[PDB]
């Protein structure tokens, strides 16, 4: 109980602050107490505003963007977690090898990467010179789905369950470059943190006890070290998931992706403040719920808290 | 004549949360400690971890305010909210900490560390502060060339020497020493103890010597105060407490202390259990869970310090041994 | 002496010395751009429109890294861009470091209501991604190089506040801060003369990550049009609306991004050198 | 049982190594208690981690002989070392709080130790773990299987380490300062536990500690370490009534037990020699009150004396305390 209650007691003051600053933005930049109550009452009924170019409600624009951003963010974080964790463990276990110097070297290069430029380079190499993978969009303009079906709005699900033959490998081919491009800073940070964490843990007194019990080197690494070295990792993961939208504004623009970052930056370039004002509230909201989820996850894995 | 320092009924309770905001328990880290300290004498405070000896040290050097009781220096009160009392508090009572590695600022030179007290509290010029600091270094056994060096350039003994030298800069007459020789080697330990006895005999200092090592206390002390669960359980001169211990915890603590000479190895009495947590203190006498002499009143009441032949003990079994009608 | 001990350990990281050599070279190119750059960064050579680098068949030594889609020389634009990139990064890091250290000492030393007010404001302005909050402020206040730099200065304060406040709470519990309080030291002396010299090791490394982030985020703002304006030689601005050249003129897409990546990598290499030298790690 | 000969442990570059242990030799019989006494920088703990194979990548170990139970620990395989470590030789370490893995319960950590060597089903293993927690004196062994290490005291943490070390009934137990971190009563409890296990299971015990008085109560034989070298060996009563090395004599005169009420304690000048400071001849040359030009030229042998003791000195002391 008490750990959850202690963290909710910091989330609520933050959510009140986000709501007060969004009310200040909506009052000061047009497209006290009674007006604040009227504003948050409207937001709770879904009245986030009307988008100036389309005249569609901001929530009815948002839902497709959130799905198409979450699908991309999931794939990018799958790439980063799957590839990054094994490499950081091997780098710490093989300290000073050609593998360690290459893993540290490539991670430092990814952590310093201008995301928008590197996606232009992969369009130029993979899509223009080698011609392996499509340059633009979420699925090929060949692909269309009967709207009669209970389509989820996630293309990797929808084109598998209700798609024609050969449409699913199209929905995957369009996903590869956006997921690698968005996943690169997360991958670099997961390699860096997994390595430093593992070298910290491999130097602890309980690893000397694990060796002194006669345990195999693989069991000392996977059972004893990695369970402890994962706690820090969890944190960073949480951090990066919040930062993925930053990378998505840059990534979605070059790949012409339907998405929440492209919708926001087009609104900021238009001065379409109804989309910006509703959008920063929903984005803010998601971040603090994600943060809360992560910290509940950390307090479940961590016995010191549990 | 008033004693140099006098503590009457000192207390320190820290409020704590039982995993919930409402229940408001008190951690009775210290309650009912009282003593008189004379000029040129060592009072040793002895006990195991959790006994209140370090919070007593922090109260006496005024790092923390007490929850109750009185603290007098030469007959005037040190617990007042009064800017005139600062001139007693900072000059006359001083502290030497346990850890030589954490008690010196690692980004200051030794000259800076010793001159900071004089810069804050005194009117001395830059030349006069350096002359006084170099004289204190020479008194404490550091070299004139050490004045430019940072704490990480010194051994644990040389760091405890800088810490003693800093403590003496304002010309004190009470020094509180919180486990001052615990981390040090045998040789370095010896070195350090010889220095503290030389400084007492030269300058007239009185020590409040907080210690876990009874071997060192049998050497440096004049009076010994034995602590259990925030209360004093036995108090008396060194010869009384080491040659005639009357309280069961003092007998157990001396019987558990290892001794090199075979003839001085006392009868082994071995206690059960852990020292109890101060969040959930035992009812009546705090030692009744571990004691070999448990008796009718011990679970019902706290005992009080009484004079039994010139030493004070807080024990109902000693009261019945001296008063058979009890 | 501790500065020679720091330099001795910094020299042990060979990558960090390679980073420092590049930063000195780019700073020299940034200072002397007026004299080194072969042409003015806005001058148009319309007889040599979309001319390739000097090592390709349509090119000449007159334009080493080629020309853009209006005939401007790319080399000169890259080094006047190096000048803007370093001046913005320096202004962002210095202002965010000064204001963040003071608010973090004031939070970590005094505690109580001051720590709660400061840390709730910091947690509110971290409720958005750094770049999204900078974009919103520059879109409220209009896009310009100055506006972008002030937005980047503001959104960076949380990291310096949170790091300094975290370091100060690790020092304030120690016996040397307590011994200084028993000796009579006031709050100003405790913060700036005693605790701050011990917090400075974390901050010297964080300033290198700050330079890297200010360069990446200024280039991101410039790419998205919400930064330096189109005539200016800023590296992200040179990558705004260039993707149609990926087939016909690879040099326009390539070299501004290598200038960013190379510069950020040099500050990140140097930063892990500062980490190896200032921590008791080796 | 254990037979160490010419053992050396080095750190740093081979042109100028830090000789943390330097041509030491000692033997342990089954059922013997051996104390290893020394100050800071003596190499005492390092000599024991070199038996366990716990010296890591920047360090080196070499010996003329390093037999345990008839097997040469220099040339056995990695698998064969794991069949000794925990099963025939076991170790307990200096800090109770850091030495148990904080992510796993006490029962997982003991049942894992039993599994690695003895095997058996879950039930069997759990039974043997309850048996061990009862044997080391835990007040409720069934509930203490389910606690995490941060819920234990220092005393209970060290009892769990002893239960986990003795789980396979080893022939040798090494105790590297097992009680330095603990209160005096808890120290007395843990060392009377170790000596009860030692006598009941007919097990060899190596006590590594700086406390001379604690070893004088516990040990049969004492080995005195200085600057990475053994300087004296002998029976625990004889060694401190009549010391045969000037170092041991100095060491005793520095104890506050060894003096009248408030007379000054003796102490040697100087500091223990590190990598750069190391003297020629005898390593006590800068400090020894009896130093002579022979001592400055020759490294002294570990001289075998008439009563069966050894001291690493050119002039082994008489019973009055003179060369
Ligand atoms: N801030 C605090 N809040 C609550 N309890 C405290 C606090 N500070 C100390 N205590 C308790 O005070 C009790 C009495 O002993 P202490 O004053 O801490 O000294 P001590 O433990 O005997 O000596 P130590 O171990 O060498 S610091 C301990 O059991 C602590 O848990
Ligand atoms: S009062 Fe009772 S419990 Fe306390 S020491 Fe005396 S006999 Fe033991
Ligand atoms: S050999 Fe010489 S210097 Fe060494 S301990 Fe003996 S008398 Fe002293």
Residue numbers in the entry:
A (entry chain A): 2 to 32, 62 to 336
B (entry chain D): 9 to 334
C (entry chain B): 17 to 298
D (entry chain C): 3 to 325
Please give sentences taken from the publication describing this entry:
In Gram-negative bacteria, the full Dpp transporter is composed of five subunits: two integral membrane proteins (DppB and DppC) that form a translocation pathway for substrates; two ATPases (DppD and DppF) that bind and hydrolyze ATP during transport and a periplasm-localized SBP (DppA) for substrate capture. The Dpp transporter is primarily responsible for importing dipeptides but also capable of inefficiently importing tri- and tetrapeptides into the cell. Different from those structurally and mechanistically well-characterized ABC exporters that solely consist of two variable transmembrane domains (TMDs) and two highly conserved nucleotide-binding domains (NBDs), the ABC peptide importers require an additional substrate-binding protein (SBP) that captures peptide substrates and delivers them to the translocator for function. Unlike the reported heterotrimeric Mycobacterium tuberculosis DppBCD translocator, the E. coli DppBCDF translocator is a heterotetramer, with a [4Fe-4S] cluster at the C-terminus of each ATPase subunit.
To achieve this, we mutated Glu179 (E179) of DppD and Glu187 (E187) of DppF, two key catalytic residues for ATP hydrolysis, into glutamine residues (DppDE179Q and DppFE187Q). These mutations prevent ATP hydrolysis without affecting ATP binding. By incubating the inert ATP analogs, AMPPNP or ATPγS, and Mg2+ with the complex for 30 min in ice prior to cryo-EM sample preparation, we determined the ATPγS (or AMPPNP)-bound structures of the mutant DppBCDE179QFE187Q. Structures reveal that both ATPγS-DppBCDF and AMPPNP-DppBCDF adopt an inward-facing conformation, nearly identical to that of apo-DppBCDF. The RMSD between the ATPγS-DppBCDF and apo-DppBCDF is only 0.27 Å for 1,112 aligned Cα atoms. Intriguingly, although sequence alignment and structure superposition indicate that DppD, similar to DppF, does possess functional ATP binding-and-hydrolysis motifs, ATP analogues are only bound with DppF but not DppD in both ATPγS-DppBCDF and AMPPNP-DppBCDF. In DppBCDF and ATPγS (or AMPPNP)-DppBCDF, the periplasmic scoop motif region in DppB is invisible due to its conformational flexibility without interacting partner. In this state, binding of a single ATP molecule to DppF in DppBCDF does not induce conformational changes, and DppBCDF does not consume intracellular ATP.
